[PDB]
């Protein structure tokens, strides 16, 4: 039934690139505030 | 509310629209709900 | 009369491209432009099908959807504004069918949208009817997720209700990624009590 | 439809979900024009 294996690749794909994503948002708003923290400082 | 949904439904010259509404408003579950 | 037919004959191109696609070079099955041609062919063919108002087309549409689908996940990287109308027109009529056979359809076309989406980065402007589209997305993941919910409630079937429900969800998720604004999901859940 | 109660087929294909364009066209602009009727400045009113 390739047919499931293509949906579930895809929402695997999905789940990855929002995990990503977040992740990056993450670090991204991590290292902002250490910036932020180093002038501040 | 069985009951009062069930007097709602009977066709019937008796029960008018208005008593219709009323019992309605006196009136697994989720279903319920949206079909009522 | 000729149903049966070509409903066999269908059958076979189905077997043949997926035995295809499944060695494409043993079958030669490299060439992108015929790799595209059979995707848009299947998906309008898809559509056709199941535009029909008044059940073997559905059958038809459905084994057409199954085929659809592995092929655009084997074929994504040679894999759309028409693309996104078409399936746009697909999840109406879904819409508008009995529920309790249009759920598998209903899915398909939604990872073949999201599919379209994820193909390229696409603003809410290039959207055609995107305040639509989203309307109707909103509209069955209401209807899907209090159907999942009262299923959820009585079971006091499991895994394909919560699956259809992620999924939504990251559809969802997606298409208000698109809108970075919320105007506009400003005005669906003003209209909706998700 | 005997009747020819236009706002009543919009809101009944509404609660239908039927999706007819030209159909949606035609009750609009039947509920404009009997209206404008019924009340033969006033007509755009009605």
Same mark, same amino acid.
């Given at each position: 039934?390739?047919?499931?294996?293509?949906?579930?690749?895809?929402?695997?794909?999905?789940?990855?690139?929002?995990?990503?994503?977040?992740?990056?948002?993450?670090?991204?708003?991590?290292?902002?505030?250490?910036?932020?923290?180093?002038?501040?400082? | 509310?069985?009951?009062?949904?069930?007097?709602?439904?009977?066709?019937?010259?008796?029960?008018?629209?208005?008593?219709?509404?009323?019992?309605?408003?006196?009136?697994?579950?989720?279903?319920?709900?949206?079909?009522? | 009369?000729?149903?049966?037919?070509?409903?066999?004959?269908?059958?076979?191109?189905?077997?043949?491209?997926?035995?295809?696609?499944?060695?494409?070079?043993?079958?030669?099955?490299?060439?992108?432009?015929?790799?595209?041609?059979?995707?848009?062919?299947?998906?309008?063919?898809?559509?056709?099908?199941?535009?029909? !108002?008044?059940?073997?087309?559905?059958?038809?549409?459905?084994?057409?959807?199954?085929?659809?689908?592995?092929?655009?996940?084997?074929?994504?990287?040679?894999?759309?504004?028409?693309?996104?109308?078409?399936?746009?027109?697909?999840?109406?009529?879904?819409?508008?069918?009995?529920?309790?056979?249009?759920?598998?359809?209903?899915?398909?076309?939604?990872?073949?949208?999201?599919?379209?989406?994820?193909?390229?980065?696409?603003?809410?402007?290039?959207? !055609?009817?995107?305040?639509?589209?989203?309307?109707?997305?909103?509209?069955?993941?209401?209807?899907?997720?209090?159907?999942?919910?009262?299923?959820?409630?009585?079971?006091?079937?499991?895994?394909?209700?919560?699956?259809?429900?992620?999924?939504?969800?990251?559809?969802?998720?997606?298409?208000?990624?698109?809108?970075?604004?919320?105007?506009?999901?400003?005005?669906?859940?003003?209209?909706? !009590?998700? | 439809?005997?009747?020819?109660?236009?706002?009543?087929?919009? /809101?009944?294909?509404?609660? /239908?979900?039927?999706?007819?364009?030209?159909?949606?066209?035609?009750?609009?602009?039947?509920?404009?024009?009997?209206?404008?009727?019924?009340?033969?400045?006033?007509?755009?009113?009605?």
């Amino acid at each position: 039934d390739i047919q499931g294996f293509l949906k579930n690749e895809k929402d695997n794909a999905l789940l990855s690139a929002i995990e990503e994503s977040r992740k990056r948002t993450f670090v991204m708003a991590e290292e902002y505030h250490r910036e932020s923290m180093l002038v501040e400082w | 509310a069985r009951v009062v949904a069930k007097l709602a439904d009977m066709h019937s010259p008796e029960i008018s629209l208005k008593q219709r509404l009323e019992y309605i408003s006196r009136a697994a579950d989720g279903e319920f709900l949206h079909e009522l | 009369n000729s149903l049966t037919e070509y409903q066999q004959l269908l059958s076979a191109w189905r077997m043949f491209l997926i035995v295809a696609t499944h060695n494409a070079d043993v079958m030669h099955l490299t060439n992108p432009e015929v790799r595209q041609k059979l995707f848009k062919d299947i998906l309008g063919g898809t559509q056709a099908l199941l535009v029909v !108002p008044r059940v073997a087309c559905m059958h038809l549409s459905s084994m057409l959807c199954t085929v659809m689908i592995i092929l655009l996940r084997r074929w994504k990287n040679d894999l759309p504004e028409d693309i996104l109308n078409s399936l746009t027109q697909i999840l109406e009529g879904v819409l508008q069918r009995d529920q309790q056979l249009v759920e598998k359809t209903k899915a398909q076309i939604f990872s073949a949208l999201i599919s379209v989406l994820e193909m390229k980065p696409m603003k809410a402007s290039e959207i !055609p009817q995107y305040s639509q589209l989203l309307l109707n997305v909103c509209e069955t993941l209401q209807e899907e997720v209090v159907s999942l919910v009262d299923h959820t409630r009585h079971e006091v079937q499991k895994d394909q209700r919560d699956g259809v429900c992620v999924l939504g969800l990251h559809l969802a998720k997606e298409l208000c990624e698109a809108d970075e604004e919320g105007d506009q999901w400003q005005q669906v859940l003003r209209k909706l !009590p998700v | 439809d005997p009747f020819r109660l236009s706002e009543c087929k919009l /809101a009944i294909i509404h609660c /239908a979900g039927h999706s007819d364009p030209i159909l949606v066209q035609t009750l609009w602009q039947d509920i404009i024009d009997k209206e404008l009727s019924d009340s033969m400045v006033d007509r755009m009113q009605s």
